[PDB]
């Protein structure tokens, strides 16, 4: 079973809104980094503090379902010299490309880049951060989390990878907890034993709007998320919860919170 | 008595490209003169020992960077300059009009050095908040603001960057103009002064201006001669890659002194 639900999301995402998605989630005021209790700051804080331990370093990194965004690698690029970026839609790989080349009409991430520099407290100016990322991002490859080999056979990516990053993928492209738990299993086939996984997801989210489609996805929870990481060969080192305030409960989702997980593969 | 007429020819927008656009205004290299200046101010304030209610910025010119670290410690500050073209240029930045100079790059790097987690927009609007007025001034006057000015004298603290040395023909009229502004300060109030070292001229478009060449120890002697006690005085040595054709400045000094 379970392949029908998956096919439902692949359909829902063919209506996907590359630049509309950014304007409505990462441009102000939904993305206001001035607010220190808010959600942009929190995600970036979790990423900066985790790499601050230095215990997550190496050679190769893979972003799992990057979408058309980068904030999730900002604090992370000073620590890996080979970044792999991935998404399922060509039109999202193409919007990232609009940003690696530095065109006008590419999304201005600079206000995230600065906040990350501020949190890391190393004196870095956001332009050198943005130059570092554009150096280390070596490839941008198609991804499907529901395959047994998510990039395909003989993929370009240097494998195994030393760590993994993923923001709002699995709980957002999986229709049932079984689909999730197996997708989490698929990407760990890419993480070398002893490497680290950094995850960010929605909590108790069952429906959201990708372009025009109203797709159906798993109401996942903090405790289910732990249980699923252990089930796949990790030990959970960190697991933090953000409670979604009233200021951003549009009517686009039933998202009640967001979680960050740091787990290491045994 | 003979006074620097040369300043009516001073283009503000060309001074701004000369000094605060890159290379000198590229804050990415941290051995550079821009970062260095901002550090001195943040460090002096992070002590909390400079604090109060009122602050006056003398010879501000068309610049604002010198109050970024400052506005978190004084609720009422006023900015001053001799020339109207400059008070107008501050006007357009504080009121957010167009044609206004983009200072964000400097706000950004001040939020970075302090490390309060500050949004650089919050820093900018806190300053626009706390600037109350933009008044003219002549530092050679025994009273440089005129009588009965809107300003709340005596201030808790003063700031001045690249002013006195850039407006005095010789050491003594500089030493005089320093005397002239100490009169503006509450005893026990603090002075934060930045200027050029062994500079003699600089360019501001068509204007070609004259500076008296001063040294670190000369700069110290003049502060005690005005009734100050220096709690810090440091020197930046202008590196080759910032020696362009806009002046002959050889270094930059910073001073933290307390009126006794
Ligand atoms: N089978 C598949 N296999 C592999 N990859 C697939 C598959 N199917 C689809 N993808 C690709 O996953 C990407 C999901 N993408 C948007 C979803 C998040 C969205 C959901 N609603 C709650 C949540 C939203 C985001 C922000 C917040 Cl705060 C909230 Cl509330 C992540 C964006 C980026 N990573 C980000 O961090 O913003 C997308 O680019 C697909 O193309
Ligand atoms: N006689 C005088 N009395 C007081 N200020 C004067 C003056 N003659 C010129 N000035 C001002 O002193 C400034 C010197 S350069 C401006 C320095 C400024 N604080 C900065 O950081 O860039 C000029 O703006 C000029 O208008
Ligand atoms: K000068």
Description:
The structure is a homodimer. Chain A has 266 residues and is of the alpha/beta class. Chain A has helices spanning 3-12, 18-25, 39-52, 71-74, 90-100, 110-120, 126-136, 177-188, 222-230, and strands at 60-63, 82-87, 137-142, 161-167, 191-203, 207-210, 213-216, 234-243, 257-265. The first copy, chain A, has one domain (1-266). In chain A, 34% of the residues lie in helices and 24% in strands. A seven-stranded mixed beta sheet of chain A has the order 3-2-1-4-5-9-8, sandwiched between helices. In chain A, β1 (60-63), α4 (71-74) and β2 form a beta-alpha-beta unit. The longest helix of chain A is centred in the first third of the chain and has 14 residues, at 39-52. Chain A is globular, with a radius of gyration of 17 Å. At the A-B interface, α6 and α7 of A face α4 and α5 of B. Chain B: It is an enzyme of class 2 (transferase). Chain B: Pfam families: NNMT_PNMT_TEMT. Chain B: Keywords: Catecholamine biosynthesis, Methyltransferase, Phosphoprotein, S-adenosyl-L-methionine, Transferase. Chain B: One of its GO terms (molecular function) is phenylethanolamine N-methyltransferase activity.
